[PDB]
Amino acid sequence: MVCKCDCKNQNCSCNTGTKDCDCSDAKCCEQYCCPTASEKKCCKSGCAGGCKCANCECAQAAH
Ligand SMILES: [Cd+2]
Ligand SMILES: [Cd+2]
Ligand SMILES: [Cd+2]
């Protein structure tokens, strides 16, 4: 329920893009791995860096 910004990620509804907590309408304060997963859910949320999903910015070869 809202991230209130000031998270441990980037481009996650904060003072660096959108207005304030605009990402989704239920969750956002998650621990993403890549910038293409913050509000793209390009990969399963929870990746603490270097996951495996090649479909995301982490690489290029599907997940
Ligand atoms: Cd991932
Ligand atoms: Cd990803
Ligand atoms: Cd990743």
Swiss-Prot record:
Induction: By cadmium. The keyword ATP-binding does not apply. Keywords: Cadmium, Metal-binding, Metal-thiolate cluster. It comes from the Eukaryota. One of its GO terms (biological process) is response to heat. Coiled coil: none annotated. GO terms for molecular function: cadmium ion binding; zinc ion binding. The keyword Metal-binding applies. This protein binds cations of several transition elements. Belongs to the metallothionein superfamily. Type 6 family. All cysteine residues are arranged in C-X-C groups. These are thought to be the metal-binding sites in other metallothioneins. This is Metallothionein-2. It comes from Caenorhabditis elegans. The lineage of its organism: Eukaryota, Metazoa, Ecdysozoa, Nematoda, Chromadorea. The gene is mtl-2.
